[PDB]
Structure formats: structure tokens, C-alpha cells
Design a protein around this motif. Structure first.
Motif, mmCIF file in Angstrom:
data_model
loop_
_atom_site.group_PDB
_atom_site.id
_atom_site.type_symbol
_atom_site.label_atom_id
_atom_site.label_comp_id
_atom_site.label_asym_id
_atom_site.label_seq_id
_atom_site.Cartn_x
_atom_site.Cartn_y
_atom_site.Cartn_z
ATOM 1 N N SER A 142 0.834 -1.193 0.000
ATOM 2 C CA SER A 142 0.000 0.000 0.000
ATOM 3 C C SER A 142 0.872 1.248 0.000
ATOM 4 O O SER A 142 1.897 1.305 0.687
ATOM 5 N N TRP A 143 0.462 2.246 -0.776
ATOM 6 C CA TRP A 143 1.214 3.485 -0.876
ATOM 7 C C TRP A 143 0.984 4.355 0.356
ATOM 8 O O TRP A 143 -0.026 4.240 1.055
ATOM 9 N N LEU A 144 1.945 5.239 0.616
ATOM 10 C CA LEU A 144 1.876 6.174 1.729
ATOM 11 C C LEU A 144 2.166 7.578 1.223
ATOM 12 O O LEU A 144 3.082 7.780 0.421
ATOM 13 N N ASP A 145 1.381 8.545 1.693
ATOM 14 C CA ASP A 145 1.542 9.943 1.308
ATOM 15 C C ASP A 145 1.635 10.790 2.567
ATOM 16 O O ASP A 145 0.739 10.745 3.416
ATOM 17 N N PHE A 146 2.715 11.559 2.685
ATOM 18 C CA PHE A 146 2.934 12.463 3.808
ATOM 19 C C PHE A 146 2.841 13.920 3.362
ATOM 20 O O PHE A 146 3.588 14.780 3.833
ATOM 21 N N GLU A 147 1.920 14.208 2.447
ATOM 22 C CA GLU A 147 1.808 15.541 1.880
ATOM 23 C C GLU A 147 1.350 16.547 2.934
ATOM 24 O O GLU A 147 0.852 16.191 4.005
ATOM 25 N N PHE A 148 1.529 17.825 2.611
ATOM 26 C CA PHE A 148 1.104 18.921 3.462
ATOM 27 C C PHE A 148 -0.200 19.512 2.931
ATOM 28 O O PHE A 148 -0.788 19.026 1.962
ATOM 29 N N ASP A 149 -0.661 20.575 3.586
ATOM 30 C CA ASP A 149 -1.851 21.303 3.164
ATOM 31 C C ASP A 149 -1.597 22.791 3.378
ATOM 32 O O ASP A 149 -0.497 23.206 3.759
ATOM 33 N N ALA A 150 -2.626 23.604 3.131
ATOM 34 C CA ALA A 150 -2.504 25.041 3.344
ATOM 35 C C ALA A 150 -2.339 25.394 4.815
ATOM 36 O O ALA A 150 -1.791 26.456 5.127
ATOM 37 N N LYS A 151 -2.797 24.532 5.723
ATOM 38 C CA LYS A 151 -2.665 24.770 7.153
ATOM 39 C C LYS A 151 -1.273 24.452 7.684
ATOM 40 O O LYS A 151 -1.044 24.592 8.890
#
Lengths: 1303, 59
Positions: free
Chosen positions: A186-195
Motif C-alpha cells: 500500500s502506498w503512503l503519502d505524507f503531503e502537506f496542506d494550506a494549514k
């Protein structure tokens, strides 16, 4: 030079390329499968990568309910039951059975005992299955029309940091999505956001906080911020401002607090850079400053402290006794402060429907990431992670360690604001290339996991004590996986075998689509580009022009695939100044740190003397000095691929037009009498020698005889006693290739000519003298001849069709079945009733066409008599039958017929009778002739073997009046015993060899007599091989060698063509407008070089005709061609081949410049202007302009006019819509689409649209009406409701809709 | 018994009978055991006698 250039000496034009010999072109898939199938003894089976590793990882299993283990010792590979030459005809799986050792033990017993009565292993063995062993040429024959598995380029396993380019941002900010792509999981994403918060978007399903992920690992809370923050040197209330702080991070910050020194003072109010304050603090035994409040106090701090860091106070209760701001924000946004809550959140994200449990959620995360059974991250993924983010040695571990996620989060929060560059997701080194080896390994691992699940489900029922060996292990999913991989897989979809270059370019084809990678739509404009690291490892020019552009780019000519998977292109390593000889295949990942200087640089005798050598330190090309250079390109053609390396003057072609020419090099049919191009490339010899369908001399001895069908060769100049003896190369005759084209080989070697080992003996399809020859060189005039080549169309002379120079075979090899239908068994007898006797011609008693009998388009090929029921009795037909007295035939005509074409003659008609009743009353003469020819070839092989054996025995006995006693070959007839004993041993070994050959032949004949492999339904299958002799009819897509394609124009006679100064008429007259529009001026330079070579050939052949082997001819050859002088007498034969034009091996980027071509034209009696006077042929007038008349290397691209023409007034219609079928399969019709119906819609032609899509195609009740009206004479029609609208309203009526007509 | 009774009906798209489904399962099991122990795939005419059934019925 090794019996392939001695008669076709090519004047090379490269400056001095000898850095590294290019590897085998098919070596990619060969070395891939040779790490997937070791095929050797036990010590050679030690392979951590391949089928052995996955097998040993999946085969050993245990039973938690009965304590039953299924151990794996080793697997033994057996030879294939069918040979490649015999499997190509049988249309079966060229596979070898897999035998694996089993060991079931029941030692672990109850009563606190570790040994039971059956504790000893049984040493079982189970038939795993048959796997398609890779052919020597890399074909992977699964059935007829062998399909080679193209390599795939999927995202390499490892952590990735794809910094967003503003898209999906708040206003303009970046995202920096840190995603780790596992090899299998399974893939993992540690992306950010505007907050400004990191969210662990697992597999892009939800956006739960990363604090939950940290809690799932256990290292979260008061210990996660240890690597993020620390303690501050603050003090308590006292006199003035007492604090034991050290100033080390106050530079570049305004002095919000008066942190002056203790005694004197420091930290002035300006606070510009603190360059002097830091030095004073360091030199003053620490930066003791005597001074904030609203800071972050989330450090380590249960008696006086509490959870969380939010005081908003002035350190009450004695204070509890801009680079990094990401971790503190995520811990507060997270609503889960316990590991159980994080596990519940993860379980709800993964499985929202299932109710999360305390232990169930913890087990889910462990099985997802902490389990190596599911999260099987390959070793390449772990090494890529260790290179991206520095970690310890983790080659053995595969699952992502708990410490790896922390390092990933740290590197992500560091790269959010500088601190290292992001990891580009579109990098060649970042995109590891997978081949047939790794793909088959993964799919066999999936099949083995399925088999392990089945064995675990089955072992609980059958006891392990006193159990039949390998009785519970299944074999269906084992072979089913490989069958699906070779049956309908996107990677095994097809094998382009139009010519030896097409096979190589198809084998060296890295397709980014298929299972495990982005589809054709998924690609987008990003992956359809070429990255800078692609240089030297993947060709940027040879790529399909269709929708799959940039996704199926073929591998470079020198590029190799490392053990990890990354493409490793060679680079001649160079030291300071002096470029050494040591070479190393630098992968794209390690190529960034190393600086590379391109080839084609003026190097001195010992080093480079330019001091401004060009190159690129990391992707971006720059001007690097002579020093600071460690890597150098091996050859200039390292960037181009195999299909592109044969483009002469490729540096002159356009970047886009070369893609058209490089794609048609692999799309050129094999032509009869095809010769090597006069202006070809030195890569042609390597691509033809390192390709299939060309027999290479595996020995050193001299050829004995050559009869086309085979070629016998002596053992060697120094051969072992009974190692192999003589090696005969059965030359492949005209067999249908995978592209329905001819595959013929000619014995270029002559009778009595010694040939060393490793050279090409007999040419393959579209080859002459060993060199690859996609087509024939034809005299070309790049002038618009009467508008026949107005567009990119290519005018044609009758000499290029009369001399049989651009004519292929294109063996169709149609297939017919005789499946036993439900209404009686289908028959294949002579003919169906109600058929004229003219169509029954050329048919034997069995019903098939006679081998070698020409069959016109539509004639009866194989009479198929299929019994059925009584047809619908019509009154008029019954009246006609009663009038003529005949009876209604109960059988329906189903005999196979040739489609509309110019096929004509039949090459081979193979019949595959059922094993039950074969040769009973059909195909008896066919099998008889087959066994007669088999016995004839066996007798010929036995005779040649006995001849060479007697020769060797005589050579051995003469050294130890023999003519008067010829029968002493087996007896010494003297007192000698040692020599007689050695002769007897050699003769017995040779007799054993003959017995093995006879055993193979008798096994073949027994398999033939027992019944060939047929499908379960059909009992008799006839595979008639019809061969065509397609000439150069107007319509054939005869494309040039550089990309200047074009349909052949009207075939002008050899009288109307433009006349040359010497009286010769050009065979083709291209259009000069294609050069300025598409910048392929190298085609003009290539044509000038071809004209120079043709004039040199006419001068040398005109010099040999007057004096054969003259003393002056060698001087002229030396002046034009030094590896030319040969002591042999082949000069009389070399001139015979050079008379058609002295061939040239021009490199892809180190060929002849303008000055070189100019000097060649001056020395070859050619005008210095490059062009030549060309008299008109139609009217006849000296053209008032210099016309380019050269020898361009034209092709005969597979997109012919015969295979592409189509015309069907009314053919077989579909079933779902009752519309005419599409394509030229069965009388299809040109689909009139929405975008093509708008052309008539915008037009006033509404009656056409009211009859083209209303009564023409989709009106079963109106189509017959309009056809009867057209046949009667009146051009009137009527069509109210088409079948398309009927099926549409029936489908809409299938749902809850009320689609219903009215008024 | 209920899954094997229903899998034998709503799985082939033609509603093969239950006894024919069990017969074809016995045939495929015999073929698998022959591939595992005896060797190569046996002829369809041999499977008719391997199960003690009519030769034409197995065809």
C-alpha cells in the motif's frame, strides 16, 4: 572483418570510438531471465534474486492447527519437452517443467516433545509446472506467433518527495507530498496542506494526521519531538536577568529581548547579522546574556508537569518545577492522543465498514506495513531509500522500519524550506526498469501465494502422518499465472518480428504502460517527456508516434539493466586530464554526483587538450574544464537506441523527424535480395549479428557443404575428442514471422571457406553479407516529378518493381478448424455441395490446397463440411429444387477461403489431426510426405556425420597402403591396441551420438503419429501457409531511412524516369519539399553519400570487368577504403559486392561532416556540388538546375496498400447493434463516427446521414430493402427506425426509464 | 454442500447441472493428479478409462 566485412568493407567515418564494445542487444532480457532461471547445479542455485528467492519465501509454510511444515530444499530444472523449431509449428507452450523438492515433517509433537514417529522428512517432489524458457534470441514462445515480453518501467520502490507545482494549493503555496512507493503493498503519502500540517494520506484514501501514524509505530507523544526540539538554557526569578544560555542562533533576528552580556553587554538593538556577537560569545567562555514568553514549550516535561504545551502564562508554579513548525502543529490538530485511537483511525480509514477493534486495528497496521508477507518492498526499494534519506544497512529488511518513517518525516520537513532538493518523480534512475524476468517473478510469486493459501486450506483436512507425497499441493494457479502472463498480459501483447531490427527494438523496449505502471491515459504530459538522466540509457528519438509516445521508449544501445533494476549506461571513466580505459556502467542515480563529458571531443595522444570540453555535471549540459572530469561517454551513439543507431547522419536529422525514421527502421518488411545500404551505419553489423533469425558460427572449422536448407561445418581447427563433433546449422526456410511476413536465411558462406566462431554464417530476413539490410538502395532524385510526389508521396520507377528489388513474401498462414459441432461432427472432406468445379481445383483428396498451388483471392482453401439442421424451407427455393430435381443439402458451406488479396501460391499446409483418430481418411498423404522428408533429412544428417567421422578417423590413423583396405575404419588389423582402443572409444561415442539423434527423431515421429496437440473441441486443424509476392504497387508506404515516409506514387516505366548523365534512370523520385518543412537534411547528406558510394562502386566494377584482380584495382580500393588489404583471394569477390556501391559505416554522431562528404564526392568522380545533371524522362530536357541524384536507402514498410486496402458493400454484421463489423477482419465497413458525421451534418447532406447511418448500416429491415432497390434500378430507400435506436431504446427500457415512441 | 450445490449452477453462465459439475471436477482432479504423479497431460481418451466411465461420455 570476421567473414562479414571482408566482402562488404565499410569505410568507417568515426573519429576514434573504441571506448567499450556495445553489449548484446538482446542481453537485457537474456540477463534478466538468467537471474530468474539459473538452470545449473546446486551451488549455482544460490540467488537472492529470481524465482528461487520468491519460491523459498512463499513455499515454506506452517500449520497452526496441526503443526505441519512444508519445507523447500531446492528445485531442479528439466529440459523443454519441445524444441523451439518444433514448438513454433505445434503452436504450443515452449516451456520446461519445474521440479521442486518437498519435505514434510511432523517432528513437533505434543506432550512437550520435539520429535514424533514421523519426524524424519519424506523428501517429496511435485510437478510445479512448465515455464516458457527464454529462447536464445529472446522470444518466449508461448504459442504460435511467438511474443517477446517487453520490459516495463514502473515507479521504483522507495520514498519520494514530489513538490507540488502550485496546483491544488491554497493560493500559490507548495505541497511537498512525501510519498514512499513500496514494491508490493500500500502506498503512503505524507503531503502537506494550506494549514502547514503533515497528513499521512495512506494510498490516497483519507487524510488522517501523521500523529496517528506515529502512534501506530509507538514513537509518538513526549518522545516524537525529541529529534525536533530540545531544552532551552533558561533560569528562574533572581537578581536582574540571570540565565545560563549560550548565544548560537540569535543571528539574523531582531533583538526582541535585551539579552546583553553579564558584565559589559552585547546583543545591540540593531541585530543585523550577529557576526561579531557570536564570535564574542564563543571567545568569552559562552554567550552569557542577561535579558521568550509566547514560544513553544512542548519539550520533555507527571508530578509537576502535564500533557500538552499551551501555557499563555509567565511560568507559573515555578515553570512546572522559524525553521521547524510542522511537528508541533500536527500533534495539536490530531484528536487522538493514544496509540489505540490511532490504530482505530487507521482501521477506519482502511476498512470503514468493518468495526475497528483494539487488537484488530493493531493487527491491520502490522499486516499492512510491519508484515513482510504483504508489504514486500524489494531490496531495490530499500537501497533507494537508503540513498535518498541516509539510514543504516537495511538490505535484508523489506518492510518500512519504524525509524525509517521518522527519517522520512524529518527529511520532508527539512525539504519543505530548502535544505536539499526534492526527489523528482520523473527521473530515469528514479524510474527503475522492469523486464520479463522481474515481471514473471512477481506474477509467479502471486501464483505461489495463491497456491500457499490453497495448501493451507487443504492441509487442515488431510493429515500429514502417512500422507501421499505432494498430494495437497496444487498446480493449476502455478501454470495459470504464467499462462495469463503470456496469454493476455499487456507486456506480452505482441512481438514485432517484421525484421531483425524490429525484434531487437521490441526486445529492448521499455514500455511504461501495462500492469504495475501508468496506463496510456495515465501517462500525461509529464512522463511523456525525456529527462536529462535518460541520456545514454534510453533513446529519446525512437518512440512510437501514436498516443503511447514517451511510454514505450526503447532502451539505449549501450544501456544495461543493473541487478537492482535501474538502467546503467556505460561511461568511460577518466582521471585528471588523462582519460583512462576503465569503464563502469554508472546508474542514473549515481550519475548526478559524477560529472560527465560527452564524446566526440578532440583528445590528444594521452589526454584531452581542449580545456573546454562539453558535458553535463548533473543533467544540465555545461562547459566543464579539462580537469574535474571523471566520467566520459563511451560512444556518441550511446544516446540513440538500436533502431535509431542505423540512421546515417542522424545528427543532421530533426529531433522529431528522426522519431519517424527510427520508428520505420523497425517497421520495414524483409525484402528478397535485400543488400546492405551503401551509406549505412556500423551499428547495422552489430544489430544483425546480435539479433535472431541469423545463424552464427558456433565453431571454428571450415564449412563442408551448403544446400540452403542446411549448412554443415567442421568441428574446429582445435576440437575436443568427443565434445561436440561437427555442428550443422539447419537454415530456417520461409516461415511466417509474427508479423505475417517472410523469415528466410541464405548461406552467405561458400563451399570450402573457413569461418571463425562468433560470426554470422547465413543472413536472416532482410540481410546481406551479415549486415542488417532493412531494404534495398535505389537511385533517388529529390525533385518534384510532374506532381506525382506533390505531398510526402514517393514517386517510383518500374525498374524497382521489374527487377524484383522491393518485393517481400508476407506468408499469411491462414488457420482453419474442424470442431465437432453439436449438430453432428464437422467434416473437412473434398468440397461442400453447390460449388463450381473451378474452385475445387488445386485440392487433393483430403480437401486442402496442394502445397505449391496458386490460389486466387476467394478460392476454396480447405473444404469444411459442417452438418447442421434443416434450413428454413422457403417456397421459392423449394420450387426451384423440385424443378431442378436436386435435394436440399443438409450441410452448410463453411469451407475456408482466402480473403481478397494477391496471395496466390501456397507454401505449406500443416494438418493437426486429433490424437484419437488421426490420418484415418484425411491428411494421409500429407503425413506420409512429412515422414518421408523427415527420414530424408535424418539420413542426410547421418551421412554427413559418418563422413566427418570417417575423415577424423582417417586423420587420426594416418599419424599412428590404407587405400587398399578401406574397411579398417573399425579395426586396426594389426598388433596395435592403444590406438585401436582410442579409435573404438571415439567410434562408440559417435555411435552414441547417432543413437541419441535417432532417438530424438523416433520420438518426433511417434509424437506425429500419435496425434499433434489439438484444442479440446476441434479434432482436425489445417494451417495453410499462403505466401504472397507483393510487388511495388502504387499505395505501398515506402518510407525512407531517415523519416521521409510517403506512399509510393504511380509506377512510372523505366523509360519515363529522369535520365542521368550516364544514361541510368533513377528508381525513385522523392520530393525536395520534405527537407525544408521537416528538418531532415541528413537525408540529403545521406543521399549524397549514397551517390558517392554508388559512383565508387560503378568505378570499381568498371575497373574489374576489364582486368579481374588487377594490380591497380587494389590501389583504387585502398584509396577509397586500413583493414582493407587481405591476403586471401577474396578481392575478386569483394569487388563483386562493391560494384553496387562501396558500403559505409557512418556513426550516429561521429560520421562524415560536410567536408568529408565533399572529399568523398571529389575522390569518387562526383560533382563537387553534391548534385548532378539529370535529364528529364517524360519529355527529355536537361534540367536548368543541379538535381540531387543519389542512392537513398529506401524501405518497404509493413503498412502496405494490400494489407490496408478495404472495400465491403455489405459484410457480416454485429449482434448487439446489427451493424457492419469494423476493420478488415471480415468484410468490415469504415465506421462513420460522430466527428465524421458532423462533416455531413454541417454540410447540407442530410439525406446521406438519413441513409448512411439510418438505412446503410443499422437497418436490418431497411438495408435489404435499399440493396434490393439498388439492384432493381431505382435509387430509392426508406428507413424509419434504425437498429441502433432500437437497441438504445431497449437498453433504456431495461432500466427504470420510460423511453417510448408516440404519434 | 450448499456452496457446492449453488456454485455448480450459478457459475458457468449456462447453469451446468450439479452432477455434471461434480463429474468435471472429478475429471480435472484426475488430470491434476496424473500431471503430478504420472507425468505429462493424459489424452482425453485415457481419462475416460481412468475414471471407469464411458469413453464417449468423457469426450
Amino acid at each position: 572483418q570476421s567473414f562479414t566485412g571482408k566482402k562488404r568493407i565499410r569505410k568507417s567515418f568515426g573519429r576514434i570510438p573504441e571506448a567499450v564494445q556495445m553489449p548484446n542487444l538482446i542481453e537485457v532480457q537474456r540477463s534478466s531471465y538468467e537471474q530468474f532461471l539459473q538452470r545449473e547445479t546446486r551451488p549455482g542455485l544460490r540467488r537472492d534474486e529470481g524465482v528461487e528467492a520468491v519460491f523459498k519465501s512463499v513455499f515454506p509454510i506452517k500449520d497452526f492447527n496441526e503443526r505441519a511444515v512444508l519445507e523447500y530444499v531446492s528445485y531442479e530444472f528439466e529440459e523443454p519437452k519441445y524444441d523451439v523449431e518444433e514448438c513454433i509449428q505445434r503452436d504450443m507452450t515452449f516451456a520446461a517443467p519445474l521440479k521442486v523438492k518437498l519435505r514434510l515433517i511432523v517432528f513437533e509433537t505434543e506432550e512437550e516433545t520435539g520429535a514424533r514417529s514421523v519426524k524424519d522428512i519424506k523428501e517429496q517432489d511435485v510437478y510445479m509446472g512448465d515455464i516458457p524458457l527464454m529462447t536464445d534470441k529472446g522470444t518466449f514462445i508461448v504459442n504460435g506467433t511467438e511474443r517477446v515480453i517487453v520490459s516495463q518501467m514502473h515507479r521504483s520502490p522507495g520514498v519520494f518527495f514530489d513538490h507540488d507545482k502550485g496546483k491544488t494549493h491554497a493560493s500559490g503555496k507548495l505541497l511537498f507530498a512525501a510519498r514512499v512507493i513500496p514494491y508490493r503493498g500500500s502506498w503512503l503519502d505524507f503531503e502537506f496542506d494550506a494549514k502547514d500540517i503533515v497528513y499521512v494520506r495512506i494510498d490516497r484514501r483519507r487524510k488522517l494526521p501523521a500523529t496517528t501514524f506515529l502512534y501506530a509505530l509507538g514513537m509518538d507523544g513526549e518522545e516524537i519531538l525529541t529529534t525536533f526540539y530540545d531544552v532551552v538554557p533558561f533560569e528562574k526569578r533572581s537578581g536582574g536577568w540571570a540565565t545560563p544560555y549560550k548565544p548560537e542562533r540569535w543571528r539574523g533576528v531582531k533583538p526582541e529581548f535585551p539579552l546583553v552580556d553579564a558584565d559589559t553587554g552585547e546583543e545591540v538593538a540593531p541585530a543585523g547579522t550577529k557576526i561579531t556577537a557570536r564570535q564574542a560569545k564563543k571567545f568569552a567562555d559562552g554567550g552569557l546574556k542577561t535579558l521568550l514568553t509566547g514560544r513553544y514549550l512542548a519539550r520533555d516535561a507527571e508530578i509537576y508537569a502535564e500533557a500538552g504545551d499551551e501555557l499563555d502564562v509567565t511560568s507559573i508554579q515555578a515553570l512546572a518545577d522559524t525553521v521547524g513548525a510542522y511537528m508541533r502543529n500536527t500533534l495539536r490538530v490530531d484528536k487522538n492522543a493514544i496509540r489505540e485511537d490511532a490504530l482505530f483511525d487507521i482501521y477506519r480509514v482502511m476498512r470503514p465498514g468493518e468495526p475497528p477493534t483494539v487488537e484488530a486495528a493493531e493487527a491491520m497496521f502490522k499486516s499492512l506495513f510491519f508484515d513482510a508477507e504483504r508489504y514486500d518492498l524489494s531490496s531495490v526499494g530499500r537501497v533507494k531509500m537508503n540513498m535518498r534519506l541516509e539510514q543504516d544497512v537495511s538490505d535484508e529488511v523489506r518492510i518500512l522500519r519504524k525509524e525509517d518513517v521518522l527519517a522520512v518525516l524529518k527529511v520532508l520537513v527539512g525539504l519543505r524550506d530548502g535544505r536539499g532538493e526534492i526527489d523528482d518523480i520523473d527521473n530515469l534512475g528514479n524510474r527503475r526498469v522492469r523486464s520479463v524476468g522481474e515481471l514473471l517473478e512477481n506474477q509467479y510469486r502471486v501464483g505461489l501465494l495463491r497456491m500457499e493459501r490453497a495448501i493451507k486450506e487443504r492441509m487442515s483436512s488431510v493429515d500429514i502422518d502417512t500422507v501421499m507425497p505432494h498430494d495437497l499441493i496444487n498446480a493449476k494457479p502455478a501454470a495459470a499465472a504464467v499462462r495469463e502472463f503470456f496469454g493476455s498480459s499487456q507486456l506480452s501483447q505482441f512481438m514485432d518480428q517484421t525484421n531483425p531490427l524490429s525484434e531487437i527494438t521490441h526486445k529492448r523496449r521499455l514500455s511504461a504502460l501495462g500492469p504495475g505502471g501508468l496506463t496510456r491515459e495515465r501517462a500525461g504530459f509529464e512522463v511523456r517527456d525525456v529527462h536529462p538522466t535518460h541520456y545514454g540509457r534510453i533513446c529519446p528519438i525512437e518512440t512510437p508516434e501514436g498516443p503511447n509516445i514517451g511510454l514505450i521508449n526503447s532502451l539505449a544501445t549501450h544501456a544495461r539493466v543493473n541487478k537492482y533494476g535501474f538502467i546503467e549506461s556505460p561511461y568511460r571513466r577518466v582521471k585528471d586530464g588523462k582519460p583512462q580505459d576503465e569503464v563502469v556502467y554508472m546508474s542514473a542515480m549515481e550519475e548526478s554526483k559524477h560529472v560527465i563529458a560527452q564524446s566526440n571531443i578532440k583528445v590528444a595522444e594521452g589526454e584531452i587538450v581542449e580545456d573546454l570540453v562539453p558535458g553535463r555535471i548533473n543533467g544540465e549540459p555545461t562547459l566543464l574544464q579539462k580537469e574535474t572530469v571523471d566520467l566520459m561517454d563511451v560512444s556518441p551513439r550511446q544516446v540513440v537506441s538500436v533502431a535509431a543507431a542505423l540512421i546515417p547522419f542522424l545528427e543532421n536529422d530533426d529531433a522529431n523527424r528522426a522519431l519517424m525514421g527510427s520508428n520505420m527502421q523497425r517497421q520495414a518488411v524483409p525484402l528478397v535480395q535485400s543488400d546492405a545500404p551503401l551509406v549505412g551505419t556500423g551499428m547495422e553489423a552489430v544489430v544483425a549479428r546480435d539479433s535472431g533469425a541469423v545463424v552464427i558460427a558456433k565453431r571454428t572449422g571450415v564449412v563442408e557443404q551448403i544446400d540452403g536448407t542446411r549448412i554443415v561445418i567442421r568441428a574446429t581447427e582445435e576440437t575436443d575428442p568427443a565434445r561436440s563433433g561437427v555442428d550443422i546449422y539447419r537454415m530456417s526456410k520461409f516461415q511466417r514471422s509474427n508479423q505475417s511476413t517472410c523469415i528466410n536465411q541464405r548461406p552467405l558462406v561458400k563451399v570450402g571457406d573457413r569461418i571463425v566462431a562468433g560470426d554470422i554464417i547465413a543472413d536472416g530476413p532482410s540481410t546481406e553479407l551479415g549486415e542488417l539490410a532493412l531494404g534495398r538502395n535505389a537511385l533517388v532524385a529529390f525533385m518534384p516529378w510532374n506532381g506525382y510526389n506533390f505531398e510526402d508521396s514517393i514517386l517510383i520507377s518500374e525498374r524497382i518493381v521489374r527487377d524484383d528489388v522491393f518485393t517481400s513474401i508476407h506468408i499469411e498462414e491462414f488457420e482453419v478448424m474442424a470442431r465437432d459441432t453439436k449438430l453432428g461432427p464437422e467434416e473437412i472432406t473434398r468440397d461442400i455441395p453447390n460449388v463450381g468445379e473451378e474452385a475445387l481445383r488445386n485440392l487433393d483428396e483430403a480437401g486442402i490446397v496442394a502445397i505449391g498451388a496458386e490460389v486466387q483471392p476467394g478460392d476454396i482453401l480447405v473444404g469444411k463440411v459442417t452438418p447442421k439442421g434443416e434450413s428454413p424451407m422457403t417456397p421459392e427455393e423449394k420450387l426451384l429444387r423440385a424443378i431442378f430435381g436436386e435435394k436440399a443439402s443438409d450441410v452448410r458451406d463453411t469451407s475456408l477461403r482466402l480473403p481478397p488479396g494477391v496471395a496466390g501460391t501456397i507454401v505449406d499446409v500443416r494438418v493437426f489431426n486429433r490424437h484419437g483418430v488421426d490420418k484415418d481418411e484425411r491428411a494421409l498423404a500429407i503425413e506420409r510426405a512429412e515422414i518421408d522428408r523427415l527420414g530424408k533429412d535424418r539420413d542426410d544428417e547421418f551421412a554427413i556425420l559418418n563422413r566427418n567421422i570417417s575423415g577424423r578417423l582417417k586423420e587420426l590413423l594416418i599419424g599412428k597402403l590404407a587405400q587398399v583396405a578401406s574397411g579398417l575404419w573399425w579395426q586396426i588389423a594389426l598388433e596395435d591396441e592403444k590406438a585401436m582402443g582410442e579409435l573404438e572409444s571415439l567410434r562408440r561415442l559417435f555411435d552414441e551420438n547417432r543413437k541419441r539423434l535417432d532417438r530424438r527423431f523416433e520420438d518426433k515421429v511417434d509424437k506425429l503419429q500419435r496425434g499433434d496437440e489439438l484444442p479440446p473441441g476441434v479434432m482436425k486443424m489445417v494451417k495453410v501457409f499462403v505466401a504472397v509476392k507483393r510487388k511495388l504497387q502504387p499505395g505501398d508506404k515506402m518510407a525512407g531511412r531517415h523519416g521521409n515516409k510517403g506512399v509510393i506514387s504511380r509506377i512510372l516505366p523505366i523509360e519515363d524516369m529522369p535520365f542521368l548523365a550516364d544514361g541510368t534512370h533513377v528508381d525513385v523520385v522523392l520530393n525536395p519539399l520534405g527537407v525544408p518543412s521537416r528538418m531532415n537534411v541528413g537525408q540529403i547528406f545521406e543521399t549524397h553519400l549514397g551517390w558517392a558510394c554508388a559512383n565508387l562502386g560503378k568505378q570499381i566494377t568498371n575497373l574489374l570487368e576489364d582486368w579481374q584482380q588487377g594490380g591497380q584495382k587494389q590501389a583504387l580500393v585502398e584509396r577509397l577504403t586500413e583493414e582493407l588489404p587481405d591476403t586471401e583471394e577474396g578481392l575478386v569477390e569483394l569487388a563483386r559486392n562493391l560494384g553496387k556501391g562501396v558500403p559505409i559505416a557512418t556513426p550516429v554522431f561521429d560520421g562524415a561532416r560536410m567536408d568529408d562528404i565533399e572529399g568523398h564526392l571529389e575522390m569518387a568522380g562526383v560533382n563537387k556540388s553534391g548534385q548532378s545533371i539529370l535529364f528529364d524522362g517524360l519529355t527529355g530536357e536537361q534540367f536548368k538546375r543541379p538535381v540531387t541524384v543519389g542512392y537513398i536507402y529506401m524501405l518497404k514498410l509493413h503498412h502496405l496498400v494490400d494489407d490496408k486496402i478495404h472495400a465491403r458493400s455489405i459484410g457480416p454484421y454485429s449482434l448487439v447493434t446489427q451493424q457492419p463489423l469494423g476493420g478488415k477482419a471480415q468484410f468490415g465497413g469504415q465506421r462513420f463516427g460522430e466527428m465524421e458525421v458532423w462533416a455531413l451534418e454541417a454540410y447540407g447532406a442530410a439525406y446521406t446521414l438519413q441513409e448512411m447511418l439510418t438505412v446503410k448500416s443499422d437497418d436490418v429491415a431497411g438495408r435489404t430493402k435499399v440493396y434490393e432497390s439498388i439492384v432493381r434500378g431505382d435509387d430509392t430507400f426508406e428507413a424509419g427506425i434504425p437498429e441502433s435506436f432500437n437497441v438504445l431504446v431497449k437498453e433504456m427500457r431495461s432500466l427504470g426509464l420510460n423511453v417510448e415512441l408516440e404519434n | 454442500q450448499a456452496i457446492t450445490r449453488s456454485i455448480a449452477d450459478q457459475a458457468r453462465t449456462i447453469r451446468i447441472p450439479v452432477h455434471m459439475i461434480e463429474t468435471i471436477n472429478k475429471i480435472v482432479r484426475t488430470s491434476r493428479q496424473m500431471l503430478h504423479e504420472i507425468g505429462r497431460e493424459p489424452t482425453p481418451e485415457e481419462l475416460a478409462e481412468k475414471l471407469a466411465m464411458p469413453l464417449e461420455k468423457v469426450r
